Every structure is written in structure tokens, then in C-alpha cells.
Amino acid sequence: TLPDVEDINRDNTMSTINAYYEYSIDVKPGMQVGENYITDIREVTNVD
Amino acid sequence: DIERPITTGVPFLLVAADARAAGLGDQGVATSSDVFSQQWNPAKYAFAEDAQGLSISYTPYLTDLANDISLGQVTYYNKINDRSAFAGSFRYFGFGGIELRQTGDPNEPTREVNPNEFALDGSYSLKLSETFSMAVAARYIRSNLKVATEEIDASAAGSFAVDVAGFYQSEEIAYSDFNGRWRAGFNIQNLGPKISYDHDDLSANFLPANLRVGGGFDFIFDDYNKLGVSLELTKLLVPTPPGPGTPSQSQADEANYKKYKDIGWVSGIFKSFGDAPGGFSEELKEITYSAAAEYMYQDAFAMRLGYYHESPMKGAKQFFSLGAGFKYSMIKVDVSYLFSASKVKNPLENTLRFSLTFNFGDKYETY
Amino acid sequence: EIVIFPNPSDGNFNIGLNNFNFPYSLEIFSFTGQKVFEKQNASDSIISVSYLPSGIYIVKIEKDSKTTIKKIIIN
Ligand SMILES: CCCCCCCCCCC(CCCCCCCCCC)(CO[C@H]1O[C@@H](CO)[C@H](O[C@@H]2O[C@@H](CO)[C@H](O)[C@@H](O)[C@@H]2O)[C@@H](O)[C@@H]1O)CO[C@H]1O[C@@H](CO)[C@H](O[C@@H]2O[C@@H](CO)[C@H](O)[C@@H](O)[C@@H]2O)[C@@H](O)[C@H]1O
Numbered sequence: 001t002l003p004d005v006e007d008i009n010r011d012n013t014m015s016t017i018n019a020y021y022e023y024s025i026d027v028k029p030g031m032q033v034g035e036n037y038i039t040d041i042r043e044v045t046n047v048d
Numbered sequence: 049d050i051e052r053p054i055t056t057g058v059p060f061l062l063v064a065a066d067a068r069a070a071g072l073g074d075q076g077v078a079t080s081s082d083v084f085s086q087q088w089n090p091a092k093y094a095f096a097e098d099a100q101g102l103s104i105s106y107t108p109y110l111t112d113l114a115n116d117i118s119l120g121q122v123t124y125y126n127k128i129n130d131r132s133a134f135a136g137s138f139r140y141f142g143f144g145g146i147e148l149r150q151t152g153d154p155n156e157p158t159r160e161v162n163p164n165e166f167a168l169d170g171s172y173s174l175k176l177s178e179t180f181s182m183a184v185a186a187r188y189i190r191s192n193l194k195v196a197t198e199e200i201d202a203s204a205a206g207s208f209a210v211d212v213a214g215f216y217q218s219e220e221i222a223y224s225d226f227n228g229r230w231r232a233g234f235n236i237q238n239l240g241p242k243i244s245y246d247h248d249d250l251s252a253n254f255l256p257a258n259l260r261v262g263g264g265f266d267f268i269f270d271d272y273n274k275l276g277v278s279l280e281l282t283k284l285l286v287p288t289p290p291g292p293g294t295p296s297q298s299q300a301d302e303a304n305y306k307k308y309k310d311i312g313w314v315s316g317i318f319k320s321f322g323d324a325p326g327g328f329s330e331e332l333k334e335i336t337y338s339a340a341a342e343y344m345y346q347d348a349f350a351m352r353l354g355y356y357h358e359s360p361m362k363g364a365k366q367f368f369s370l371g372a373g374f375k376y377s378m379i380k381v382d383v384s385y386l387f388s389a390s391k392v393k394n395p396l397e398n399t400l401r402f403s404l405t406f407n408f409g410d411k412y413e414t415y
Numbered sequence: 416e417i418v419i420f421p422n423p424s425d426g427n428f429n430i431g432l433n434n435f436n437f438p439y440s441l442e443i444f445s446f447t448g449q450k451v452f453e454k455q456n457a458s459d460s461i462i463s464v465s466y467l468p469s470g471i472y473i474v475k476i477e478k479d480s481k482t483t484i485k486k487i488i489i490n
Binding site (some may be wrong): 082109110112113114144146147148149150154163194195197200367393395 | 419421422423431432444446447448460471473475484485486487488490
């Protein structure tokens, strides 16, 4: 029900600054734990 | 601690809802006939001394913290003949009103929701012999504990169950020092299809199908004093979830859980007697027991003591219970208190359960 | 009046004090009755108790002689 506004934090002001930190993860078929910020892999075999 | 407890849907069906049975260590399958004899044994409704009875029972949760979080019960029995009786019970566990608000507007119409769980059941009891009776009960269970938000549907989950009960009450038999009375009872309850809280055939929970077998004896002194000792054994009729593994590493557990969850309730009732690496000695660990003694003075004062013990490996709910009952003219008031003896914090600690019943209609002679 | 920001929260919610004497005592209780959150000298509106397991919780607000008990949902 809310109008679409170019103001996301609802402070009535539109910010135009672009000072941020950037992180990235790869999406590949054969990813494993220990790289790409991967900490755990749970393989589920029999899904109903 | 608890090792692989049995998980079932709507566990509130297993909570004692009246003060009389609460004071007797959560047993009623073989005690004297009373208005609250619907959760325990409807078959003794045919043995009721009074024609018609109504009862309101209150079990508060978080007594100090807040009200409205409680299990209430309304029971009404009516024995039309000397041989049969119709009874109807309504158990309601509720948290009271909860207000849902997303903005700090002082003037804002907000949504008040009451998550709850109620079971409405009706039982017919018929006296087969002069000392034995059967009973069949139909129960509808509805759970509305979740709250409607985004990406969450609060549709209530419903189910049906059938209860088969039997009660035996012997004649008053004279002995050397007293003239006591024997009672026995059995009850197979909560027999029905699984309840799906997510409304999906893939995810369903077993109903808490239960088997209760008990026996009791009354020592009658001077015809005005009674001392009834009762013992009840309770066993869940639901398969025990697999533990370490009964065939990679997690794949064995996944296969075991898939096998366990793909079991019908009818087959699950019979599978409950076993389906574990342990034998009969370990099978006896699935049975919980309760022993109580109730003293009756002038049939108007009742002092009840009880002890309830579950296995330490499941549930872990052992306690002692005290209860007092007073009948003024036709109104009986029961109060119950619980002293826990287990390591897990019982939510019924420091709680005084209340029960209030009215009896009306003509009197039926006891045989 | 005491106002609780979104009732079915994830553990992070807010208080709706009406700009009065800010020091109030807030206590969050589990369904077991256990004490799971204490907060004296409280003035920050945002409350972060998202380490608690899901369920209903009881929030007691003590503001001078005023005592208030409300029920919140953590899902
Ligand atoms: C599905 C259940 C429906 C609910 C059942 C309610 C039954 C009400 C009947 C009143 C009653 C039971 C007390 C129950 C109170 C529990 C209230 C719980 C409160 C909850 C928080 C109180 O009667 C007692 O109470 C006194 C009132 O203080 C009465 O005083 C006086 O009371 C008034 C003269 O009676 C004066 O007008 C008043 O001036 C006096 O003061 C006394 O007469 C008496 O001591 C006596 O029962 C008697 O009334 C009839 C009615 O037709 C009942 O008929 C039954 O109805 C169906 C049964 O439902 C059955 O199917 C049906 O077969 C059967 O014919 C019988 O039972 C009968 O024996």
C-alpha cells in the first residue's frame, strides 16, 4: 500500500553518497568448504 | 538426561486439566467416578452417582507473571438411565489477548489475536454388566497457536480422534478389618489421522495416542471414612524416533528419520511395542506410572496425595501432588498443588489448580 | 501508554515510551518463567534479544509506580 519512493531509510531525504564496503562470493557448481567464505555444507540425499 | 523423547502433535492433550486428578498424581483411569472423568476414563460416567454434572477447571501458567495464559476445561455429563451416559468436554489452552502493532501511533486500530489450542469431545458410556462398562468418545482438536504475518499463514490445524475406554467397579467386599471395593480401568485414546500444522501431506505429526491401564482399591472404615489407593500405567502409542542410527554420516540419520516419518498411525500404534535396539527390559522404560492415595471424610472432605514418575530418558516429569476437595451442598471445590522432583523445570511448579463442579438431578444408587 | 514495536519480531524490537522520565526497568521472561533479559537504567528504545529461542515472551515495564505486562512473539 505504500508509494514507491527513492528514500529507503524513511528519513524523508534521498541520499546520493556512494561510500561503502564491497564483499563478493562466487557461485560455481563445485564449491567446497574453506574458500569463498564457505563455512559449512550440508548435503541432503532423500528429499520427499 | 532425556534420550530420544517421543514427539507428537498437540501435546496439550496430555496435560491434566482438573484439580482432582492433578492431586492424585495425574491419574484418573481407575479412581472413583467423577465429573472430570472424560480425559481419563469416560467409561465410569455410567457409574456416576449423580444424574447431571457440570464442571469448570482452571490451570494457570506463569501464575506470578501474567494471567490469561492457562488451560481451562468445561465438562458436562448426563446419565439418562441406570446403564448409559452422554458426556461432553471442552479443553482450551490459551495465552489471552496479544496486541500486534507496527507503528507508534497513539490512535491506531491494532489487531488483537489469541493463539490457542482446544479439543471438543463427546463420549457415550454404556454399562455392559452390572459392574463393567464401555465408552466410545469422538474428539476434535484444533490448534491456532501461530500468528498471521507476511510469509506465515496462521491457518488452524485440525484433526479427529476416537477413544475407547473400559471401567470395572466391583461390589463392596467385606474383609477382616474393613470392607473395601475394587476398581480397574483401561483407555486407548487419541486414535486418529496425523495433524499437519503446515497443511502439507509431506509434513505431519502423530496424534498423542495413549494407553492408560490402572487399578485401585478402597478401604472403607466405619462406612463414613474412605481411603482409596490407585495405580496407573501410561504408555504412548507413537513410534520412538531413531537415535544414533539403525540402517555417509548424516545420510544414515536422514534415512532413519525418513523411515520413521513415513509410518501410518494405525501401524504406528502396533510398532510402538518395540522398534528399538533394546529388549523388553528397555521396552519397560516407555511406561510411566502414578500412585495415589485419597482420603474421604463424610464424602465431603477429600485429602489426596499422589506421585507421578516418568522415565528419566523421556519427558523427565516426576513429582508429588497434594489436593483438597470440599462439597458444601451440591458444589464441589478442588484445589491441587505440585512439588516437582525432576531436573527439568516443570511449567506447573508453584501453580494451584482450581476445579469447581455442580451436581444436579436425581440420585442413582451405587452397586 | 506503553507501545511495543512489531509484536511478531525476530528478537529485535522497540519500545514506545511517550517522552517521560527515561529511566525505566525492562524485564523479559520466557514461557518457562525464567529470567532471560534484564535492563535497568534503560533509555535506548531498540531492544536486541534475538539470541532467545522462538516463542512467546512476557515483557514487564516498570516506570515509577506504573507496572505493565505485555506479550510479544519471537518468530
Ligand atoms: C448443556 C449444559 C447447559 C447448562 C446447564 C445449566 C443447568 C441450569 C439448571 C439449574 C440448576 C442446575 C445448576 C447449574 C448451575 C451451573 C452454572 C455454571 C456457571 C458457569 C460459570 C440450579 O439449581 C440449583 O441452583 C439454585 C440457584 O442458585 C436453585 O435455586 C433456584 O433455582 C431456580 C429453580 O430451579 C429458581 O428460578 C431460582 O429462583 C432459585 O434460586 C436451586 O433450584 C438448586 O439448588 C437445577 O437444575 C434443574 O433445572 C432444570 C432446568 O430446566 C434442569 O433441566 C435439565 O436441563 C438440561 C441440562 O442442561 C438437561 O439436558 C435436561 O435433561 C434437564 O431437564 C435440571 O437439571 C433441573 O435439575
